[PDB]
Amino acid sequence: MKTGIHPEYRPVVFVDTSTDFKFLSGSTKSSSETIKWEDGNEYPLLRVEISSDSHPFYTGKQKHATADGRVDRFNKKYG
Amino acid sequence: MLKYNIRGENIEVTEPIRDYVEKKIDKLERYFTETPDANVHVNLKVYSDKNAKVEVTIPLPNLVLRAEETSGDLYASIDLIVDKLERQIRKHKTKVNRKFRD
Amino acid sequence: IAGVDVPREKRIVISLTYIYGIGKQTAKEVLAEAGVSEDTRTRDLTEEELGKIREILDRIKVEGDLRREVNLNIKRLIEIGSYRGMRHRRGLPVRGQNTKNNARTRKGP
Amino acid sequence: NRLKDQYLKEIVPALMSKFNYDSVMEVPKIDKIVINTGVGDATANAKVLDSAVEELALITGQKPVITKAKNSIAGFRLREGMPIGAKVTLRGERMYDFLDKLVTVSLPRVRDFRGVSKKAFDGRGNYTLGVREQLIFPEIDYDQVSKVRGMDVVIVTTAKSDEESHELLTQLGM
Amino acid sequence: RSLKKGPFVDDHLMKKVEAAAESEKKQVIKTWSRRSTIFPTFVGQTIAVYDGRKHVPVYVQEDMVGHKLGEFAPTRTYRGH
RNA sequence: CUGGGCUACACACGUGCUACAAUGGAUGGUACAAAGGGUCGCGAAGCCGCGAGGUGGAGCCAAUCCCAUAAAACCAUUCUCAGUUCGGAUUGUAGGCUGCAACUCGCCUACAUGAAGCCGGAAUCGCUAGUAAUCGUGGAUCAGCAUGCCACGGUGAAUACGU
Numbered sequence: 001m002k003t004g005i006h007p008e009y010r011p012v013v014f015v016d017t018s019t020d021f022k023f024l025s026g027s028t029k030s031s032s033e034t035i036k037w038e039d040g041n042e043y044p045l046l047r048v049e050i051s052s053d054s055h056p057f058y059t060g061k062q063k064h065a066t067a068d069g070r071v072d073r074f075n076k077k078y079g
Numbered sequence: 080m081l082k083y084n085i086r087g088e089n090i091e092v093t094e095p096i097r098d099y100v101e102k103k104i105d106k107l108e109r110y111f112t113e114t115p116d117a118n119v120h121v122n123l124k125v126y127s128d129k130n131a132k133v134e135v136t137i138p139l140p141n142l143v144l145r146a147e148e149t150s151g152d153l154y155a156s157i158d159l160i161v162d163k164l165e166r167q168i169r170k171h172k173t174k175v176n177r178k179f180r181d
Numbered sequence: 182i183a184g185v186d187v188p189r190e191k192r193i194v195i196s197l198t199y200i201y202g203i204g205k206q207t208a209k210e211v212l213a214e215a216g217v218s219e220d221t222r223t224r225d226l227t228e229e230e231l232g233k234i235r236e237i238l239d240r241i242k243v244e245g246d247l248r249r250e251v252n253l254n255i256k257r258l259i260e261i262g263s264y265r266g267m268r269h270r271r272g273l274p275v276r277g278q279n280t281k282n283n284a285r286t287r288k289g290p
Numbered sequence: 291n292r293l294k295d296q297y298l299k300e301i302v303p304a305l306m307s308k309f310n311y312d313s314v315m316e317v318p319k320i321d322k323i324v325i326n327t328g329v330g331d332a333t334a335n336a337k338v339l340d341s342a343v344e345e346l347a348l349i350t351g352q353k354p355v356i357t358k359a360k361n362s363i364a365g366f367r368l369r370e371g372m373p374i375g376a377k378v379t380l381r382g383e384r385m386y387d388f389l390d391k392l393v394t395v396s397l398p399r400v401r402d403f404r405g406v407s408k409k410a411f412d413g414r415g416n417y418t419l420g421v422r423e424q425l426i427f428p429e430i431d432y433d434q435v436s437k438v439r440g441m442d443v444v445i446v447t448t449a450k451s452d453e454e455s456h457e458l459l460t461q462l463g464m
Numbered sequence: 465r466s467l468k469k470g471p472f473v474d475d476h477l478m479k480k481v482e483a484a485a486e487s488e489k490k491q492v493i494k495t496w497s498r499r500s501t502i503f504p505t506f507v508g509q510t511i512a513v514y515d516g517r518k519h520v521p522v523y524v525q526e527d528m529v530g531h532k533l534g535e536f537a538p539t540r541t542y543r544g545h
Numbered sequence: 546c547u548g549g550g551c552u553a554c555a556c557a558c559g560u561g562c563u564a565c566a567a568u569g570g571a572u573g574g575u576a577c578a579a580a581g582g583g584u585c586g587c588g589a590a591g592c593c594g595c596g597a598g599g600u601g602g603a604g605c606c607a608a609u610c611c612c613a614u615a616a617a618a619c620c621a622u623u624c625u626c627a628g629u630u631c632g633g634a635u636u637g638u639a640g641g642c643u644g645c646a647a648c649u650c651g652c653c654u655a656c657a658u659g660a661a662g663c664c665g666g667a668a669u670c671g672c673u674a675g676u677a678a679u680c681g682u683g684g685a686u687c688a689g690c691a692u693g694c695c696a697c698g699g700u701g702a703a704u705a706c707g708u
């Protein structure tokens with residue numbers, strides 16, 4: 001580990017604002033925050049968008065949409 | 080770069096006729112050293128007594144070229160309509176240059 | 182931020198319209214069910230405000246899902262043999278407008 | 291840090307009584323992660339290369355080493371020794387933490403998230419992923435982005451064939 | 465009929481295919497009415513539609529329901545310049 | 546008699562409409578006309594729908610009733626010089642209306658997509674006062690369909706030494 005030629009890599013605690021999903025994995029970005037978790041992990045409380053707990057392929061997303069029947073729609077629309 | 084437009088009435092505008100009109104009126108470029116691109120209006124008509132007519136209009140900016148002829152067959156009129164047109168280009172060009180040079 | 186980066190100096194009513202599938206009028210309802218004023222800068226809304234908007238915008242369709250659906254409809258017409266398919270496949274005007282002149286916005290230069 | 295713990299505490303027994311391995315060290319693991327970028331377009335302008343270099347250094351934690359061309363192909367207006375590309379090699383704690391971040395928060399950011407390819411194996415147990423958008427990784431920001439450009443994260447595993455690598459990756463969470 | 469009072473289906477065309485369900489794509493139908501929306505009952509059938517000078521056969525699918533017959537019978541014969 | 550076509554399309558030309566934004570876009574309030582049409586016709590109030598529109602039937606063979614709220618302009622807020630809150634082509638979906646029938650091939654509405662375009666080369670056109678410029682309105686043909694045509698009014702210039 002050569003010194004003086006690497007960017008800082010202080011630990012950080014992740015938090016998912018979508019569903020309050022705590023996560024711990026150190027990251028390079030400081031993000032200017034402070035929060036301690038899991039018996040002491042004082043580090044930035046890095047906010048983030050949806051994590052793997054809500055994504056379609058990374059989670060159990062059910063529909064988020066609907067389907068079509070066309071001939072069913074033709075029968076429903078026409079009557 | 081001249082763009083042609085033949086209005087063939089009472090006659091069929093065959094390709095040999097189109098080539099003849101295009102190549103004969105194309106030699107006017109030597110005179111008017113910059114002919115701005117313009118549309119040529121050509122009209123052809125034949126009577127019952129075997130007479131042919133050609134009308135040409137070439138609206139150059141300050142030069143309104145016209146000539147209309149009646150002769151026996153179609154080809155004679157086209158060959159004889161250059162003389163009326165060439166006169167007007169020579170008339171208009173040499174009128175401008177020599178008069179401003181008193 | 183809300184599906185994709187939105188402008189910062191702009192306004193929330195205007196910034197939202199930068200994502201495919203949303204418009205000026207629909208931005209009135211998503212800012213109404215969110216219960217937040219229209220005249221609010223994007224770099225002023227809190228997490229509580231931004232959270233409701235993302236929840237509200239989830240119900241409506243957005244980019245990608247809408248981008249693929251329209252293309253799927255275009256594909257359905259290409260091989261079914263409908264008349265609109267040849268217009269779509271050849272780039273000529275699809276609806277009922279002429280072609281002798283003024284079809285450049287679809288045919289190109 | 292934790293992902294290694296769950297790997298060696300739960301995934302290891304699963305591979306044990308799923309593949310009926312003779313001894314312990316026959317179970318496959320992840321050896322290294324190597325990330326590569328290409329700046330072949332930086333033949334004239336040598337500064338976009340540098341920008342990508344600090345991008346990689348920021349995104350991983352270790353400065354990349356600039357790679358030099360091994361040939362002088364005239365089709366790509368090249369001469370030998372021209373600096374093309376960069377690489378960051380992760381081995382140990384950094385590897386596990388980066389893979390955890392990639393799988394839990396980076397992948398759920400692609401514009402069309404339908405699932406990673408199931409046929410991206412070289413045939414001998416190594417997986418190559420091909421993300422091609424800059425801030426798929428949450429760390430870098432949109433304002434700092436100067437040119438959208440892709441990346442090549444490569445995972446090298448000790449498994450002897452494709453399928454057991456597939457189950458190892460699924461166990462990890464790919 | 466592009467309104468609530470629709471849809472519009474031609475009588476003599478509709479009746480002919482209705483009694484042709486026993487055939488089950490065993491006879492070509494030769495008709496002129498291009499202004500009839502394609503019904504679910506038409507699915508699987510083959511109809512010959514007049515394109516201005518002749519009859520062109522089309523096999524009805526499920527995707528063709530709700531469209532007009534003439535959409536699949538191009539009239540103008542264009543082959544470039 | 547049915548169907549198609551006169552609506553085609555690599556392209557060239559003429560005549561028009563809309564723009565390329567701050568004297569502007571958007572939102573709210575409000576004032577000021579003339580000239581015409583209406584009986585197998587105009588069609589109000591009321592109720593419904595975001596909308597185009599639907600039900601309803603008053604009055605009118607009309608200086609009486611309807612078409613029919615004129616628009617630019619004025620007053621407030623906001624946007625802050627960007628291919629944008631400019632521009633609207635193009636396209637997907639869902640509708641309305643006429644007609645026996647809207648695919649070739651009609652007009653209009655709702656949602657979303659958002660293109661060229663930041664004043665135009667050579668050349669060239671119109672206009673002398675309620676004129677040019679700009680904004681609305683009506684009528685003929687017409688079941689439906691006009692950026693065309695024929696008429697009406699609102700605001701309202703600059704310049705003409707001279708041949």
Ligand SMILES: [Mg+2]
Pocket residue numbers: 158161
């Ligand atoms: Mg000669």
Ligand SMILES: [Mg+2]
Pocket residue numbers: 277278279
């Ligand atoms: Mg039309």
Ligand SMILES: [Mg+2]
Pocket residue numbers: none
């Ligand atoms: Mg005509």
Ligand SMILES: [Mg+2]
Pocket residue numbers: none
């Ligand atoms: Mg606008």
Ligand SMILES: [Mg+2]
Pocket residue numbers: 647
């Ligand atoms: Mg239509």
Ligand SMILES: [Mg+2]
Pocket residue numbers: none
């Ligand atoms: Mg719209």
Ligand SMILES: [Mg+2]
Pocket residue numbers: none
């Ligand atoms: Mg441009």
Ligand SMILES: [Mg+2]
Pocket residue numbers: 663
């Ligand atoms: Mg500008």
Ligand SMILES: [Mg+2]
Pocket residue numbers: 687
């Ligand atoms: Mg009319």
